Amino acid sequence: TVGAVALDLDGNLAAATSTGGMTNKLPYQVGPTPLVGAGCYANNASVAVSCTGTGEVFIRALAAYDIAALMDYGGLSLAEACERVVMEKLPALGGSGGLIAIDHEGNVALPFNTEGMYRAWGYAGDTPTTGIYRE
Amino acid sequence: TVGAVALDLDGNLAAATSTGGMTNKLPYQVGPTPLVGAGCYANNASVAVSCTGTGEVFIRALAAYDIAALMDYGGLSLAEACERVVMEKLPALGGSGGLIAIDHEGNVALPFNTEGMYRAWGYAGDTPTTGIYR
Amino acid sequence: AVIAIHGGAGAISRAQMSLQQELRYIEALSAIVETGQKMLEAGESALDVVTEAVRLLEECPLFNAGIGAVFTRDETHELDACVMDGNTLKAGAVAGVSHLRNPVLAARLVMEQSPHVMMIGEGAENFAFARGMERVSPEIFSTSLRYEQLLAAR
Amino acid sequence: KAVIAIHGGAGAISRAQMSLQQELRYIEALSAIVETGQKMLEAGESALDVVTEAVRLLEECPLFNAGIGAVFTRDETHELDACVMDGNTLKAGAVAGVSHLRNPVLAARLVMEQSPHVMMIGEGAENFAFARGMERVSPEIFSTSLRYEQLLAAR
Ligand SMILES: [Cl-]
Ligand SMILES: [Cl-]
Ligand code: NA
Ligand code: NA
């Protein structure tokens, strides 16, 4: 699974996610990746999110939309919303993985509950950060 | 599209939706019905929802889960949440249709923005209500 | 303890319908909601109740699900269903199936006998067939009225 | 405040399993793709085009399980999925279970931009894309010896 989220100079948010799924999967099994609000979600009013992880739990938990709703309706900060989803609700369902999120204010979050997540981010006109292991 | 939602005597919520989709659909186009949080959602902590409508808008709007989130996180009543989703947000996206919802407290809503929705509901051991039109 | 059901929303026309025509739908909706109320009153689970209500709506040829499914551009039937258990937050869904009489029962099988949540097409069918669910021809879903609506929509 | 984030998947990435040279191949790919996105954003390209290109690059990068380098199914095939969503219009496009499209995210964007639909599946998604002039490929092009070795390891 791979993904990108971005906020542009016009204040637009967008998200994208792509995958080959789990090694040894049944053909015709559908994980979160192509499912709006599971693997991918963006709304100028809240957040752009791209998920990677235990597939089913991301669907059942609608992880990508839950970040947005926690922020939009619950008034959680991006950081609080990412902690709630990735560190509390996903583990509660036995879900492992993470996601990347940018909010309408340009805050960025790359939470994950696994040993690693291949990840990177950067402000336009700034130097990028990259990571693999837990920070 | 057809659906059911229920609260049992143990306080459990469940939802189910089934469809043949839009007349003259492309085969291998996917409406909300099989998409968790679009056509169907249930959580003992909030609501059970079954949707029917312009399919794409119910997906883009994640209508079934939005009821639950509007209630759980937004503190909206089932009635407020159903009004917000079916009467404001779906039309705002050019989406037409409705849904049925029961919350963990046994409140029931059957909102729709269309000319009709074939619907019924009833409390266990009480008489059922049926409807077609507004 | 409470049930609600629907048989779809849209442009259902009053000036198009007789009371006798309307009463066919009212009778079907009341009979299914009554079955669910009686199950709930007897202490059946929300999951069994919504499963059986949707099975009956599938069987009811007046509603666009199972028997009475609309026709695709190719004069075929492709069916979808979903079920979710609010107690476990487990879900099962089948999308684009043509050889399962009751997609909601297939959806429940995916929920109960797999972690997959959503299965599509031949995969969903093979999953159900491997667990002894019977294969049907999509011709069993066909009704004159939905065929007339296909010809109308073109 | 323009900004990009990318990922290449979360899991049991083992430090005792990896050489620094192996790690640097991932770091180099992540930095090149994030830098392309930053440069596009800085030049005023749209969030949608930015996440589309970043995910296309992650697809092409055989280190990551999407497009080239996709994991193998039980049947030693590849089946790919993708989604894209525009926060401005709340339009989305998605493809599930495609094997003959080089860049599933471009097929997802085709559904978003050139259909009134959100999600297409399997041969239907492929026939839709081919009819819009997207090239057909063999799923063999996605195959890498490393993902094959992980399949053999799992069974
Ligand atoms: Cl690191
Ligand atoms: Cl009425
Ligand atoms: Na039916
Ligand atoms: Na790749």
Numbering used by the authors:
A (entry chain DDD): 179 to 313
B (entry chain BBB): 179 to 312
C (entry chain AAA): 4 to 157
D (entry chain CCC): 3 to 157
Task: Kindly provide excerpts from the paper associated with this entry.
l-Asparaginases hydrolyze l-asparagine to l-aspartic acid and ammonia. The prototypic class 2 enzyme is EcAIII from E. coli. EcAIII belongs to the Ntn-hydrolases, which are expressed as immature polypeptides that dimerize and then autocatalytically cleave themselves into α (∼20 kDa) and β (∼15 kDa) subunits to form the mature (αβ)2 heterotetramer (a dimer of two αβ heterodimers).
The side chain of Tyr206 occupies the space between Glu81 and Glu125. The nearby side chain of Glu234 is rotated towards Arg238. In contrast, in the second dimer subunit (D) Glu234 is directed towards the center of the active site and is hydrogen-bonded to the Nɛ2 atom of Gln207. The small side chain of Ala at position 207 is neutral; it does not affect the protein structure and does not participate in hydrogen bonds. In both the RDM1-8 and RDM1-24 variants the D210S/S211T substitutions are similar in their chemical character to the natural residues and support the pattern of hydrogen bonds typical of the WT protein. Similarly, in our variant RDM1-8 the R207Q mutation did not abolish autocleavage.
